[PDB]
Amino acid sequence: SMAWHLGIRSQSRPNDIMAEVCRAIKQLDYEWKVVNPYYLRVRRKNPVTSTFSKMSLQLYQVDSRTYLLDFRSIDDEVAPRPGSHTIEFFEMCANLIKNSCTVN
Amino acid sequence: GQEMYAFRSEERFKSPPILPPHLLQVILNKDPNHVMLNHLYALSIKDSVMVLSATHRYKKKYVTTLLYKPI
Amino acid sequence: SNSSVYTTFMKSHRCYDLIPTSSKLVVFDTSLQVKKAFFALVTNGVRAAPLWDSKKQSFVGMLTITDFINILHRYYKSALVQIYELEEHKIETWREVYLQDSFKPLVCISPNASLFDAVSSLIRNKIHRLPVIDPESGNTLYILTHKRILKFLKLFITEFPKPEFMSKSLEELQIGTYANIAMVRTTTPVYVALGIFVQHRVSALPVVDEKGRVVDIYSKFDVINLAAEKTYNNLDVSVTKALQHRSHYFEGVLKCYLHETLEAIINRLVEAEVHRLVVVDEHDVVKGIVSLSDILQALVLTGG
Ligand SMILES: Nc1ncnc2c1ncn2[C@@H]1O[C@H](COP(=O)(O)OP(=O)(O)O)[C@@H](O)[C@H]1O
Ligand SMILES: Nc1ncnc2c1ncn2[C@@H]1O[C@H](COP(=O)(O)O)[C@@H](O)[C@H]1O
């Protein structure tokens, strides 16, 4: 595991990016709020555990041609019970990428 | 009563902000940095496997979790 | 000797206390290919990985080198009879092939539980990895091990409110195994070694010569090295030849005598950073093994 990349990168139209993530968010039944045209706070109910999870998406420019989608988990406030805040964040991000977005 | 007028900033959000709050785009880790916490990192996709990763705090301890997940 | 200083220390410290400031943790979704999963353990420099079940949304188990060992034995035998299932298996489907009626729920511990609870749990469940899971988050923070725990003990207990039992020998305290020692010879094939691993559930095998004297050690970890090859075929080779493909570590070399005091042995284990000592005689003939679990079981039951 050598090279770690922050978020994902795209050369799509920024507006096309934001509009599409919003479309994936609503299809997945998440709630969300638009803070900026490039910054979203999303919140999901766990269909299994009934717990809530929050994250932030922020769009950045790297090239004059290229943009980067950033994902940030937002913090809340013997056998294991169901649920993990960390894994569920990854799954959120994963669901969102799959549903808004295609590989080049 | 006269018609009123509207001055719209418009190009306040012309383009996404430029990157670095010194947030690192790429981290190389071949066999700390303070606030890339809670942010998503990923390896290049290989043979239909995703590897997601982040660093979180519990009290004063930090764990970097890596998930290996098929697509 | 003592209602131990050890006992008291273990009861008054939380599992959180042993966690390094910074650590990495590898997690596998149970729908991952086993072949990919084990390759990943190696890649990351890690010996164990928690397993996440997506449908249930919870941790369900652990994938260790012992599993990699069970899987490889089954693969080698199955192949000889033309059954090529396992390598395209998913962790799930193999956990479905093994567990069946035999229940193995994941055992974990809170960062707020005692170290004594942690040592009891490892011993009772006959296990080498103990995930520390935050009951508030559901997050796995760290994987606890004997080697870790012994180091912490040696480090943070003063030397000299010293129990009498620290001056007594392995013989008088009866610590270690002195019968039915699973062993291999210089020329033993790796696939025979595996067979021994699967049957005796032991983590390393002493390598002996014709008079039964110890010349090396062959280990289960030496097995996940069979995950560097992108072929799997190399299995018929002698244990010697396989330890040439070695990179580093070293054990095997770590001998002790029946009459060394517990203090000397603890010091040697912690300093050398090794998982067991090969108990030996005047002439290097193996007589037993003394491993980290032996020692932790000893310290938790107040010497003995
Ligand atoms: N905390 C745990 N809960 C449930 N099962 C476990 C746990 N840790 C290990 N196991 C399982 O028990 C078996 C023994 O492995 P173990 O001896 O603990 O580790 P290793 O094989 O690395 O020495 C393995 O099949 C492993 O998957
Ligand atoms: N090669 C071996 N043969 C017989 N017993 C062993 C061997 N290695 C370890 N043991 C014993 O098995 C138990 C667990 O071993 P370990 O895998 O070293 O934690 C301990 O009581 C050891 O003394």
Coordinates of C-alpha atoms and ligand atoms in Angstrom, one line a residue:
Chain A
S1 CA 0.0 0.0 0.0
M2 CA 2.3 2.8 -1.3
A3 CA 0.4 5.7 -2.8
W4 CA -2.6 7.2 -0.9
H5 CA -4.8 9.7 -2.6
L6 CA -7.1 12.3 -0.9
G7 CA -10.6 11.7 -2.1
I8 CA -11.3 11.3 -5.8
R9 CA -10.4 13.5 -8.8
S10 CA -12.4 14.5 -11.8
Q11 CA -12.2 16.8 -14.9
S12 CA -16.0 17.0 -15.2
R13 CA -17.8 20.4 -15.0
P14 CA -17.9 21.4 -11.2
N15 CA -21.6 22.2 -11.5
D16 CA -22.1 18.8 -13.1
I17 CA -20.2 17.3 -10.2
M18 CA -22.2 19.0 -7.5
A19 CA -25.5 18.4 -9.2
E20 CA -24.8 14.7 -9.6
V21 CA -23.7 14.1 -6.0
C22 CA -26.9 15.8 -4.9
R23 CA -28.8 13.3 -7.2
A24 CA -27.0 10.4 -5.7
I25 CA -27.7 11.7 -2.2
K26 CA -31.4 11.9 -2.8
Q27 CA -31.6 8.5 -4.5
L28 CA -29.9 6.9 -1.5
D29 CA -32.4 8.6 0.8
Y30 CA -29.9 10.6 2.7
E31 CA -30.7 14.1 4.0
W32 CA -28.4 17.0 3.1
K33 CA -27.8 20.7 3.3
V34 CA -26.0 23.1 0.9
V35 CA -23.7 25.3 2.9
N36 CA -21.8 26.6 -0.2
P37 CA -22.2 25.7 -3.9
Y38 CA -19.2 23.4 -3.2
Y39 CA -19.8 22.2 0.4
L40 CA -22.4 19.8 1.7
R41 CA -23.4 18.4 5.0
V42 CA -25.1 15.0 4.6
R43 CA -26.8 12.8 7.2
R44 CA -27.9 9.2 7.0
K45 CA -30.1 6.8 9.1
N46 CA -28.7 3.3 9.4
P47 CA -31.4 1.0 8.1
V48 CA -30.2 -1.8 10.3
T49 CA -29.1 -0.2 13.6
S50 CA -31.3 3.0 13.5
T51 CA -28.2 5.1 14.4
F52 CA -27.4 8.4 12.6
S53 CA -24.2 9.3 10.8
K54 CA -22.9 12.6 9.4
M55 CA -20.3 13.7 6.8
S56 CA -19.1 16.7 4.8
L57 CA -18.3 16.9 1.1
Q58 CA -16.2 19.7 -0.2
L59 CA -15.1 20.4 -3.8
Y60 CA -11.6 21.7 -4.5
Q61 CA -9.6 22.9 -7.5
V62 CA -6.2 21.4 -8.1
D63 CA -5.5 22.2 -11.8
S64 CA -7.1 24.6 -14.2
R65 CA -8.7 21.4 -15.6
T66 CA -9.0 19.3 -12.5
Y67 CA -11.1 19.1 -9.3
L68 CA -11.1 17.0 -6.1
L69 CA -14.0 15.7 -4.0
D70 CA -13.2 15.6 -0.3
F71 CA -15.0 13.5 2.3
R72 CA -14.9 14.2 6.0
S73 CA -16.5 12.2 8.8
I74 CA -18.2 14.4 11.4
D75 CA -17.9 13.3 15.0
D76 CA -20.9 12.6 17.2
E77 CA -21.8 15.6 19.3
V78 CA -18.1 -9.8 25.9
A79 CA -19.6 -9.6 22.4
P80 CA -19.8 -6.6 20.0
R81 CA -23.0 -4.8 19.3
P82 CA -23.8 -3.9 15.7
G83 CA -22.3 -0.7 14.2
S84 CA -19.0 1.2 13.7
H85 CA -18.8 4.9 13.1
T86 CA -15.6 4.4 11.1
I87 CA -16.7 1.6 8.8
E88 CA -20.1 3.2 8.2
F89 CA -18.3 6.4 7.1
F90 CA -16.4 4.3 4.5
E91 CA -19.6 2.7 3.4
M92 CA -21.3 6.0 3.1
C93 CA -18.5 7.4 0.9
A94 CA -18.5 4.2 -1.1
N95 CA -22.3 4.2 -1.8
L96 CA -22.0 7.9 -2.8
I97 CA -19.2 7.3 -5.3
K98 CA -20.9 4.3 -6.9
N99 CA -24.2 6.1 -7.3
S100 CA -23.1 9.5 -8.6
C101 CA -20.1 8.7 -10.6
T102 CA -18.3 6.4 -13.1
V103 CA -14.7 5.4 -13.7
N104 CA -12.5 6.8 -16.5
Chain B
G1 CA -42.8 54.2 -6.0
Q2 CA -39.7 53.4 -8.1
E3 CA -38.5 49.9 -9.2
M4 CA -35.7 48.6 -7.0
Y5 CA -32.4 47.1 -8.2
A6 CA -30.3 44.0 -7.6
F7 CA -26.5 43.7 -7.4
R8 CA -25.5 40.0 -7.4
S9 CA -21.9 39.1 -6.5
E10 CA -22.1 36.1 -8.9
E11 CA -18.4 35.4 -9.2
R12 CA -18.0 34.9 -5.4
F13 CA -18.3 31.2 -6.1
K14 CA -17.1 31.3 -9.8
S15 CA -14.9 28.2 -9.1
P16 CA -14.3 25.7 -6.3
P17 CA -11.7 26.9 -3.7
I18 CA -8.0 26.2 -4.3
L19 CA -6.8 23.3 -2.3
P20 CA -4.3 23.5 0.5
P21 CA -5.3 24.4 4.1
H22 CA -2.1 22.4 3.6
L23 CA -4.1 19.2 3.0
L24 CA -2.0 16.7 1.3
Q25 CA -3.2 15.4 -2.0
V26 CA -0.9 12.4 -2.0
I27 CA 0.7 10.5 0.9
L28 CA 3.3 7.9 0.2
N29 CA 3.8 5.1 2.8
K30 CA 6.5 2.6 1.9
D31 CA 7.7 0.0 4.5
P32 CA 2.4 13.0 12.4
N33 CA 0.5 15.4 10.1
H34 CA -2.0 17.0 12.4
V35 CA -5.4 17.6 10.7
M36 CA -6.0 15.4 7.8
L37 CA -8.0 13.5 10.4
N38 CA -11.4 12.2 9.5
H39 CA -10.7 12.7 5.8
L40 CA -11.0 9.9 3.2
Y41 CA -8.0 8.5 1.5
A42 CA -7.9 5.7 -1.1
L43 CA -5.4 3.5 -3.0
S44 CA -5.6 3.1 -6.7
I45 CA -8.2 0.4 -7.6
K46 CA -6.8 -3.0 -8.4
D47 CA -8.5 -6.2 -9.5
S48 CA -12.0 -4.9 -8.5
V49 CA -10.9 -4.1 -4.9
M50 CA -11.4 -0.8 -3.1
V51 CA -9.1 0.3 -0.3
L52 CA -10.5 3.1 1.8
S53 CA -8.6 4.7 4.8
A54 CA -8.8 7.4 7.4
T55 CA -7.3 8.4 10.8
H56 CA -9.5 9.0 13.8
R57 CA -8.9 10.0 17.4
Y58 CA -10.0 8.2 20.5
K59 CA -9.0 10.4 23.4
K60 CA -5.2 10.8 22.7
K61 CA -4.8 7.7 20.5
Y62 CA -4.9 7.7 16.7
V63 CA -5.8 4.8 14.5
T64 CA -5.6 4.6 10.8
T65 CA -8.2 2.2 9.6
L66 CA -7.9 0.6 6.2
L67 CA -10.9 -1.2 4.7
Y68 CA -10.5 -3.7 2.0
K69 CA -13.8 -4.0 0.1
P70 CA -14.8 -5.5 -3.2
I71 CA -16.9 -3.6 -5.8
Chain C
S1 CA 4.7 -16.3 46.8
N2 CA 2.5 -13.3 46.3
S3 CA -1.1 -12.1 45.7
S4 CA 1.0 -10.6 43.0
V5 CA 2.3 -7.2 42.3
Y6 CA 1.5 -8.4 38.8
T7 CA -2.2 -9.1 39.7
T8 CA -2.6 -5.7 41.4
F9 CA -1.0 -3.9 38.4
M10 CA -3.3 -5.7 35.9
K11 CA -6.4 -4.9 37.9
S12 CA -5.6 -1.2 38.2
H13 CA -4.8 -0.4 34.5
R14 CA -7.2 -0.1 31.6
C15 CA -6.7 -1.6 28.2
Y16 CA -6.5 1.9 26.8
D17 CA -3.2 2.3 28.6
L18 CA -1.4 -0.2 26.3
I19 CA -2.5 1.4 23.1
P20 CA 0.3 3.1 21.2
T21 CA -0.2 6.8 20.3
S22 CA -0.5 5.8 16.6
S23 CA -1.3 2.5 15.0
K24 CA -2.8 1.1 11.8
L25 CA -5.6 -1.4 11.5
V26 CA -6.7 -3.5 8.6
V27 CA -10.3 -4.6 8.2
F28 CA -11.8 -7.1 5.7
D29 CA -15.4 -7.1 4.5
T30 CA -16.5 -10.8 4.7
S31 CA -17.3 -10.7 0.9
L32 CA -13.6 -10.3 0.1
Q33 CA -11.7 -13.0 -1.7
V34 CA -9.5 -14.9 0.8
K35 CA -6.6 -15.0 -1.7
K36 CA -6.8 -11.1 -1.8
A37 CA -7.3 -10.9 1.9
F38 CA -4.1 -12.8 2.9
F39 CA -2.0 -11.0 0.3
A40 CA -3.2 -7.8 2.1
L41 CA -2.0 -8.9 5.6
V42 CA 1.5 -9.4 4.1
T43 CA 1.4 -6.1 2.1
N44 CA 0.6 -4.1 5.2
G45 CA 2.9 -5.7 7.7
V46 CA 0.1 -7.0 9.9
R47 CA -0.7 -10.4 11.5
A48 CA -4.5 -10.1 12.1
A49 CA -7.5 -8.4 10.7
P50 CA -11.1 -7.7 12.0
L51 CA -14.0 -8.9 9.8
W52 CA -16.9 -6.6 9.0
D53 CA -20.3 -8.0 7.8
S54 CA -22.0 -5.5 5.6
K55 CA -25.6 -7.1 5.8
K56 CA -25.5 -7.3 9.6
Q57 CA -23.5 -4.0 10.0
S58 CA -21.2 -5.4 12.7
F59 CA -17.9 -7.0 13.4
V60 CA -18.3 -10.8 13.3
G61 CA -14.8 -12.4 13.6
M62 CA -11.0 -12.3 12.9
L63 CA -8.8 -13.5 10.1
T64 CA -5.4 -14.6 11.3
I65 CA -2.4 -16.6 10.0
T66 CA -3.8 -19.7 11.6
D67 CA -6.8 -19.3 9.2
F68 CA -4.4 -18.8 6.3
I69 CA -2.9 -22.1 7.5
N70 CA -6.1 -24.0 7.7
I71 CA -7.1 -22.7 4.3
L72 CA -3.8 -23.8 2.7
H73 CA -3.9 -27.3 4.1
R74 CA -7.4 -27.7 2.7
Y75 CA -6.3 -26.3 -0.6
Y76 CA -3.2 -28.6 -1.0
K77 CA -5.3 -31.7 -0.2
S78 CA -8.3 -30.7 -2.2
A79 CA -6.1 -30.1 -5.3
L80 CA -4.7 -33.7 -5.1
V81 CA -8.3 -34.8 -5.6
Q82 CA -9.2 -32.1 -8.2
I83 CA -11.2 -29.7 -6.0
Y84 CA -10.2 -26.1 -6.7
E85 CA -12.9 -24.2 -4.7
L86 CA -11.2 -22.4 -1.9
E87 CA -9.0 -19.8 -3.7
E88 CA -12.1 -18.3 -5.4
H89 CA -14.1 -18.6 -2.1
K90 CA -15.1 -15.5 -0.2
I91 CA -14.2 -15.2 3.5
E92 CA -18.0 -15.7 4.1
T93 CA -18.2 -19.0 2.2
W94 CA -15.2 -20.3 4.0
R95 CA -16.5 -19.2 7.4
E96 CA -19.6 -21.1 6.3
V97 CA -17.4 -24.2 5.5
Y98 CA -15.7 -24.2 8.9
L99 CA -18.0 -22.8 11.6
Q100 CA -21.2 -24.6 10.8
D101 CA -22.6 -25.9 14.1
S102 CA -19.4 -25.0 16.0
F103 CA -20.0 -21.4 17.2
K104 CA -17.0 -18.9 17.3
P105 CA -18.4 -15.5 18.2
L106 CA -15.9 -12.7 18.0
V107 CA -14.4 -11.9 21.4
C108 CA -13.5 -8.3 22.1
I109 CA -12.9 -6.0 25.0
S110 CA -13.7 -2.4 25.9
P111 CA -10.9 0.2 26.3
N112 CA -12.2 0.7 29.8
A113 CA -11.9 -2.9 30.9
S114 CA -8.9 -4.0 32.9
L115 CA -5.7 -5.6 31.6
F116 CA -6.5 -8.5 33.9
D117 CA -9.8 -9.0 32.1
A118 CA -7.8 -8.8 28.9
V119 CA -5.2 -11.5 29.9
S120 CA -8.1 -13.7 31.3
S121 CA -9.9 -13.4 27.9
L122 CA -6.9 -14.4 25.8
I123 CA -6.2 -17.4 28.1
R124 CA -9.8 -18.6 28.4
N125 CA -10.6 -18.3 24.7
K126 CA -7.3 -19.9 23.7
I127 CA -6.5 -16.9 21.4
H128 CA -3.6 -14.6 20.3
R129 CA -5.5 -11.5 19.3
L130 CA -7.9 -9.4 21.3
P131 CA -9.6 -6.5 19.6
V132 CA -10.2 -3.4 21.8
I133 CA -13.6 -2.0 20.6
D134 CA -15.1 1.3 21.9
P135 CA -18.6 0.5 23.1
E136 CA -19.7 4.1 22.3
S137 CA -18.3 4.1 18.7
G138 CA -18.3 0.5 17.7
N139 CA -14.8 1.2 16.6
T140 CA -11.9 -1.3 16.8
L141 CA -9.0 0.8 18.2
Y142 CA -6.2 -1.7 18.5
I143 CA -5.4 -5.5 18.5
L144 CA -4.0 -6.6 21.9
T145 CA -1.3 -9.3 22.1
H146 CA 0.7 -11.3 24.7
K147 CA 3.9 -9.9 23.4
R148 CA 2.5 -6.4 23.8
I149 CA 1.2 -7.2 27.3
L150 CA 4.3 -8.8 28.7
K151 CA 6.4 -5.8 27.4
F152 CA 4.1 -3.4 29.2
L153 CA 4.4 -5.4 32.4
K154 CA 8.2 -5.7 32.4
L155 CA 8.5 -2.0 31.6
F156 CA 6.2 -0.5 34.2
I157 CA 6.6 -2.6 37.3
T158 CA 9.5 -1.6 39.6
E159 CA 12.1 -4.4 40.0
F160 CA 12.3 -4.7 43.7
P161 CA 9.0 -5.1 45.5
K162 CA 9.9 -8.5 44.1
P163 CA 7.8 -11.7 44.6
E164 CA 9.8 -14.8 45.8
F165 CA 8.6 -16.6 42.7
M166 CA 10.7 -14.5 40.4
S167 CA 13.8 -16.2 41.8
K168 CA 12.5 -19.7 41.2
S169 CA 13.3 -21.8 38.1
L170 CA 11.0 -22.9 35.3
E171 CA 11.4 -26.4 36.7
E172 CA 10.1 -25.6 40.2
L173 CA 7.3 -23.4 38.9
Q174 CA 6.4 -25.8 36.1
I175 CA 6.1 -23.3 33.3
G176 CA 6.1 -24.5 29.7
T177 CA 5.4 -27.7 27.9
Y178 CA 7.6 -30.7 28.4
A179 CA 5.8 -33.5 26.6
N180 CA 4.7 -34.3 23.0
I181 CA 6.8 -31.5 21.6
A182 CA 5.8 -31.0 18.0
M183 CA 9.0 -30.9 15.9
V184 CA 10.4 -31.1 12.4
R185 CA 13.7 -32.3 11.0
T186 CA 16.1 -30.5 8.6
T187 CA 14.6 -32.3 5.6
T188 CA 10.9 -32.3 6.5
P189 CA 8.7 -31.0 3.7
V190 CA 6.7 -27.8 4.3
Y191 CA 3.4 -29.6 3.6
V192 CA 4.2 -32.0 6.4
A193 CA 5.0 -29.1 8.7
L194 CA 1.6 -27.6 7.8
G195 CA -0.1 -30.8 8.8
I196 CA 1.5 -30.6 12.2
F197 CA 0.4 -27.0 12.6
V198 CA -3.2 -27.9 11.8
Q199 CA -3.4 -30.9 14.2
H200 CA -1.5 -29.6 17.3
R201 CA -2.7 -25.9 17.0
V202 CA 0.9 -24.7 17.9
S203 CA 2.5 -21.5 16.6
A204 CA 6.1 -22.6 15.9
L205 CA 8.0 -25.9 15.3
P206 CA 11.6 -26.5 16.4
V207 CA 13.9 -27.7 13.6
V208 CA 16.2 -30.5 14.8
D209 CA 19.1 -32.6 13.5
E210 CA 19.6 -36.4 13.7
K211 CA 20.6 -36.3 17.4
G212 CA 17.5 -34.2 18.1
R213 CA 19.4 -30.9 18.7
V214 CA 17.9 -27.6 17.8
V215 CA 19.3 -25.8 14.8
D216 CA 16.4 -23.5 13.7
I217 CA 12.7 -22.7 14.3
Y218 CA 10.0 -23.0 11.7
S219 CA 7.0 -20.8 12.3
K220 CA 3.4 -20.1 11.2
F221 CA 4.4 -16.6 10.2
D222 CA 7.0 -18.3 8.0
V223 CA 3.8 -19.4 6.3
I224 CA 2.3 -16.1 5.2
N225 CA 5.6 -15.8 3.4
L226 CA 4.0 -18.4 1.1
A227 CA 1.8 -15.5 0.1
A228 CA 4.7 -13.6 -1.6
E229 CA 4.7 -16.1 -4.5
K230 CA 1.9 -15.5 -7.1
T231 CA 1.7 -19.2 -7.8
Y232 CA 1.2 -21.2 -4.5
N233 CA 2.8 -24.4 -6.0
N234 CA 6.1 -24.5 -4.0
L235 CA 5.2 -26.9 -1.1
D236 CA 7.2 -30.0 -1.6
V237 CA 10.5 -28.4 -0.5
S238 CA 12.5 -29.1 2.7
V239 CA 11.9 -26.9 5.7
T240 CA 15.6 -25.9 5.5
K241 CA 15.3 -24.7 1.9
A242 CA 12.2 -22.7 2.7
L243 CA 14.0 -20.8 5.5
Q244 CA 16.5 -19.6 2.9
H245 CA 13.7 -17.5 1.4
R246 CA 13.8 -15.9 4.8
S247 CA 14.2 -12.2 5.2
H248 CA 14.3 -11.4 8.9
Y249 CA 13.3 -12.1 12.5
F250 CA 15.1 -14.9 14.2
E251 CA 14.3 -17.3 16.5
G252 CA 15.1 -20.9 17.3
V253 CA 18.3 -19.5 18.3
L254 CA 16.4 -18.6 21.5
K255 CA 17.1 -21.3 23.9
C256 CA 16.8 -21.5 27.6
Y257 CA 17.5 -24.1 30.3
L258 CA 15.1 -25.8 32.7
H259 CA 16.8 -24.2 35.6
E260 CA 16.7 -20.5 34.7
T261 CA 14.6 -18.2 37.0
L262 CA 11.3 -16.7 35.8
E263 CA 13.0 -13.3 36.0
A264 CA 15.8 -14.3 33.6
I265 CA 13.3 -15.8 31.1
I266 CA 11.0 -12.8 31.2
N267 CA 13.9 -10.5 30.6
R268 CA 15.1 -12.7 27.6
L269 CA 11.7 -12.9 25.9
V270 CA 11.0 -9.1 26.3
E271 CA 14.5 -8.1 25.2
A272 CA 14.9 -10.4 22.2
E273 CA 11.2 -9.6 21.2
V274 CA 10.5 -13.3 20.6
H275 CA 7.3 -15.4 21.0
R276 CA 8.8 -18.4 22.7
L277 CA 12.0 -20.0 24.1
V278 CA 13.2 -23.5 23.1
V279 CA 14.0 -25.3 26.5
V280 CA 17.2 -27.2 26.0
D281 CA 19.7 -29.4 27.9
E282 CA 23.5 -29.6 28.4
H283 CA 24.0 -30.8 24.8
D284 CA 21.3 -28.7 22.9
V285 CA 18.8 -31.5 22.9
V286 CA 15.2 -30.0 22.9
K287 CA 13.2 -30.8 26.1
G288 CA 10.4 -28.3 25.9
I289 CA 9.1 -24.9 24.9
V290 CA 8.3 -21.9 27.0
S291 CA 6.1 -19.4 25.2
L292 CA 4.6 -16.0 26.1
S293 CA 1.2 -17.5 26.8
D294 CA 2.8 -19.9 29.3
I295 CA 4.2 -16.9 31.1
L296 CA 1.1 -14.8 31.1
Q297 CA -0.9 -17.7 32.4
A298 CA 1.6 -18.0 35.2
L299 CA 1.5 -14.3 36.1
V300 CA -2.3 -14.2 36.1
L301 CA -2.7 -17.2 38.5
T302 CA -0.1 -15.6 40.9
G303 CA 3.1 -17.4 39.9
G304 CA 2.9 -21.2 39.6
Ligands
LIG1 N1 -10.9 -12.1 19.2 C1 -11.3 -13.3 18.5 N2 -12.6 -13.7 18.5 C2 -12.9 -14.8 17.8 N3 -12.1 -15.6 17.2 C3 -10.8 -15.3 17.1 C4 -10.3 -14.1 17.8 N4 -9.0 -14.0 17.5 C5 -8.6 -15.1 16.8 N5 -9.7 -15.8 16.5 C6 -9.7 -17.1 15.7 O1 -9.2 -18.2 16.4 C7 -8.2 -18.9 15.7 C8 -6.8 -18.8 16.4 O2 -6.1 -17.7 16.0 P1 -5.0 -17.1 17.0 O3 -4.2 -18.3 17.5 O4 -5.8 -16.3 18.0 O5 -4.1 -16.1 16.2 P2 -2.8 -16.5 15.3 O6 -3.4 -17.6 14.4 O7 -2.4 -15.3 14.6 O8 -1.8 -17.0 16.3 C9 -8.2 -18.3 14.3 O9 -9.0 -19.1 13.5 C10 -8.8 -16.9 14.5 O10 -9.5 -16.5 13.3
LIG2 N1 6.3 -26.9 19.2 C1 5.5 -27.1 20.3 N2 5.1 -28.3 20.7 C2 4.3 -28.5 21.8 N3 3.8 -27.5 22.5 C3 4.0 -26.2 22.1 C4 4.9 -25.9 21.0 N4 4.9 -24.6 20.9 C5 4.1 -24.1 21.8 N5 3.6 -25.1 22.6 C6 2.7 -24.9 23.8 O1 1.3 -24.6 23.4 C7 0.8 -23.5 24.1 C8 0.5 -22.3 23.2 O2 1.6 -22.1 22.4 P1 1.9 -20.8 21.5 O3 1.4 -21.0 20.1 O4 3.4 -20.7 21.6 O5 1.2 -19.7 22.4 C9 1.8 -23.2 25.2 O6 1.4 -23.8 26.4 C10 3.1 -23.8 24.6 O7 4.0 -24.2 25.7

